[PDB]
Design an enzyme around this catalytic site. Structure first.
Site, PDB file in Angstrom:
ATOM      1  N   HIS A  87      45.368  38.389  44.604  1.00 38.10           N
ATOM      2  CA  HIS A  87      45.757  36.828  44.902  1.00 38.10           C
ATOM      3  C   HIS A  87      46.023  36.242  43.347  1.00 38.10           C
ATOM      4  O   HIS A  87      46.359  35.110  43.197  1.00 38.10           O
ATOM      5  CB  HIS A  87      44.628  35.861  45.242  1.00 38.10           C
ATOM      6  CG  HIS A  87      43.333  35.421  44.867  1.00 38.10           C
ATOM      7  ND1 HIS A  87      42.261  36.229  45.147  1.00 38.10           N
ATOM      8  CD2 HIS A  87      43.315  34.846  43.678  1.00 38.10           C
ATOM      9  CE1 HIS A  87      41.276  35.625  44.431  1.00 38.10           C
ATOM     10  NE2 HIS A  87      41.948  34.873  43.389  1.00 38.10           N
TER      11      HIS A  87
ATOM     12  N   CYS B  69      36.506  34.989  39.429  1.00 40.40           N
ATOM     13  CA  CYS B  69      37.269  36.050  40.389  1.00 40.40           C
ATOM     14  C   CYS B  69      37.474  37.508  39.821  1.00 40.40           C
ATOM     15  O   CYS B  69      37.791  37.283  38.544  1.00 40.40           O
ATOM     16  CB  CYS B  69      38.591  35.438  40.896  1.00 40.40           C
ATOM     17  SG  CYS B  69      38.433  34.366  42.483  1.00 40.40           S
TER      18      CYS B  69
ATOM     19  N   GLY C 282      35.026  30.592  38.991  1.00 41.62           N
ATOM     20  CA  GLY C 282      35.759  30.741  37.653  1.00 41.62           C
ATOM     21  C   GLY C 282      35.706  32.515  37.415  1.00 41.62           C
ATOM     22  O   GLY C 282      36.767  32.793  36.492  1.00 41.62           O
TER      23      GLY C 282
END
Ligand SMILES: CN(C)c1ccc(C(=O)O)cc1
Lengths: 300, 300
Positions: free
Chosen positions: B40, B144, B142
């Site tokens: 993503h 990922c 924060g």
């Protein structure tokens, strides 16, 4: 916040060594050409009863000490005593020595501990120095010489070295100058931890953390006097709050717009009446191992 | 079993990098010549509401990915997708790569997470994979592409990569093959965490740890059938205990001299009567985030 976190331990892992005198093995800290370890490494059973350390040390040669950094034997070319620490000069300066300082923390402050066994990093955990100068750790079969540290940017502040288990299973040790935290001594005596209190400064910081994260049901309309707060809190076995502590909580108080004594008034009500089944930051209890700085470091 | 202990994180720190796509930046894991990060990274606010990743990825070149190990750029020279991960090939191997495995863990198992922000390690914490496949505590915001792992000897077992925050604070992520734990997807839907239970096996393990540490007050003279234990524990939102679970508790049962069904009888009474203002290993609640293996490793 929610999760208690330790500092990443990599920088400290690269400094850990195993130190052996005859039959005793513990951990040392290798920084440049010096290894630091508890002086009681030179001690045996009978020695721990009443050791004349400076006598036992006169006996030792450099070749007495086996220093092992992973697979390499570091040659010991000097030794000396600084308080409750042995300092061993080695022939190799540690290529992983991080930027570092030695600090002495205050009671109630937090730090990370890297637990090691025989020179080999085993686990990392976050703890506080208690008001009674001991740590509620998890130090097992051969963890002496393990260090506590904070990391600010790429600078490691070493603050703690582990020396002894106390009769209650709690831990006692020194700063990196070899000075004990607490009245404790590195010999077998009847020494016991004093009674402990809750770290009020830290509970207050955690209540600020909760409010910053939107969990604020415990706030009220009222204020209190500092003294009126301490009158209540001390009945609950909370450390008297000082004006210094009030000032330490200043930035969090300005961040949230909640005066420290307004927050004390909320704590006062929490202690007298309880949570009533509720949670703060997903906790059923008032947490005391996060400092004002921890709170600012994480969420804020 | 007083302290949750994380694995020392240095082997994993040396593997963390930043991966940037447009104005999206997150963490990647650099193992040899490859960088793993969530897919993503290629998405925006438009895309995240309904992405076709295959159609998004085909629109990308090697030059569209900026990967940084510290201040140093790594050039991307290949890219592919493996389920919900992006695999980037870079023109240097990471000399800091440890020995390693990718493993898919099972619910109720524990691991350490090195929380990172923009490829910079921030903190390490120990946690459990919840039976509903989420990770609790709100402390991966924060971060990922931060990874969970276990360490055995010198070998890192990577088990988890952080992807998403659910509407309930808890986190969801994948294995290092890109497969989600639980029924979640990497888009912005109203997907929620399923019902969660208490990890029965872990609670029993921790109760054993308390007996080993000399905390014994909750034991009783009663025993129970597995069936009757289950009829009760299931009322309190506890995972059904199977004979496989009883068997795992063998070593700990043999160590303490307490029969597993006898210890279940203790837990039944503790569920039915509450803890009555007492603590077990310092906790006012029954802890389910230490596995039996953790208890052997750390408690005894
Ligand atoms: C929050 C949770 C996860 C992330 C992924 O980067 C960002 C904010």
């Amino acid at each position: 916040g929610f999760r208690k976190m330790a500092f990443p331990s990599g920088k400290v892992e690269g400094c850990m060594v195993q130190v052996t005198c005859g039959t005793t093995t513990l951990n040392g800290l290798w920084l440049d050409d010096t290894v630091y370890c508890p002086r009681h490494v030179i001690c045996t059973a009978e020695d721990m009863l009443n050791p004349n350390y400076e006598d036992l040390l006169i006996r030792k040669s450099n070749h007495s000490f086996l220093v092992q950094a992973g697979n390499v034997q570091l040659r010991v070319i000097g030794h000396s005593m600084q308080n409750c620490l042995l300092r061993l000069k080695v022939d190799t300066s540690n290529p992983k020595t991080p930027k570092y300082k030695f600090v002495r923390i205050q009671p109630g402050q937090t730090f990370s501990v890297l637990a090691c066994y025989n020179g080999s990093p085993s686990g990392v955990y976050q703890c506080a120095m208690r008001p009674n100068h001991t740590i509620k750790g998890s130090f097992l079969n051969g963890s002496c010489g393990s260090v506590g540290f904070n990391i600010d940017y790429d600078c490691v502040s070493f603050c703690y070295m582990h020396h002894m288990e106390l009769p209650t299973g709690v831990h006692a040790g020194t700063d990196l100058e070899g000075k004990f935290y607490g009245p404790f001594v590195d010999r077998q005596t009847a020494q016991a931890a004093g009674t402990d209190t809750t770290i009020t400064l830290n509970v207050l910081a955690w209540l600020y953390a909760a409010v910053i994260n939107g969990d604020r049901w415990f706030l009220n309309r009222f204020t209190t006097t500092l003294n009126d707060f301490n009158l209540v809190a001390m009945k609950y076995n909370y450390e008297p709050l000082t004006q210094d502590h009030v000032d330490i909580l200043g930035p969090l108080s300005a961040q949230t717009g909640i005066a420290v004594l307004d927050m004390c008034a909320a704590l006062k009500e929490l202690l007298q009446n309880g949570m009533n089944g509720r949670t703060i930051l997903g906790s059923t209890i008032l947490e005391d191992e996060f400092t004002p700085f921890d709170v600012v470091r994480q969420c804020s």
